[PDB]
Amino acid sequence: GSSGSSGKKPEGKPDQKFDQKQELGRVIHLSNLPHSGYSDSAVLKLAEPYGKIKNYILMRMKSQAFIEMETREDAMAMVDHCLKKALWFQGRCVKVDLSEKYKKLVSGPSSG
Numbered sequence: 001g002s003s004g005s006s007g008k009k010p011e012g013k014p015d016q017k018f019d020q021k022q023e024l025g026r027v028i029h030l031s032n033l034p035h036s037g038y039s040d041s042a043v044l045k046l047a048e049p050y051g052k053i054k055n056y057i058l059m060r061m062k063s064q065a066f067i068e069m070e071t072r073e074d075a076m077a078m079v080d081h082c083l084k085k086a087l088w089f090q091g092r093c094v095k096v097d098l099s100e101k102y103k104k105l106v107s108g109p110s111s112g
Contacts, residue, residue: 025103026072028079033063034090043067046089050078055105068105 028047040058047053047067051074057066069075075098081087082096 024072025099026069026075027099027102027105028067028069028075029095029097029099029102030065030067031062031095031097032092033065033094034092035063036090038090042090046087046094047078050074050081057105066099066102066105068102 030043030046033043040056043058043065044053044056044067047069050069052070053067054070055068059065069078079096079098082094087094087096
């Protein structure tokens, strides 16, 4: 018949975080790239000397690329080096930046 409680009883113990700065946003932007039909490793090896890479997106349109670094210090060091001496690749001068838009790189939207 009736009961003062559900058949689903209590179990486990709660462990949920309130608030933490677990990570910061870090994606390198590359523009004015060469056009020679190269493998993705050719672009990735521009960022490999400065730190570890998580994710990337190449764009043939206007010859651009995006690269997610493991750390924001590893990313900012690539920008600082380019500001001191400009990056050259396959005989083209590369526009090196760090994106305010891109916190990380993911295929498709974050929604379901």
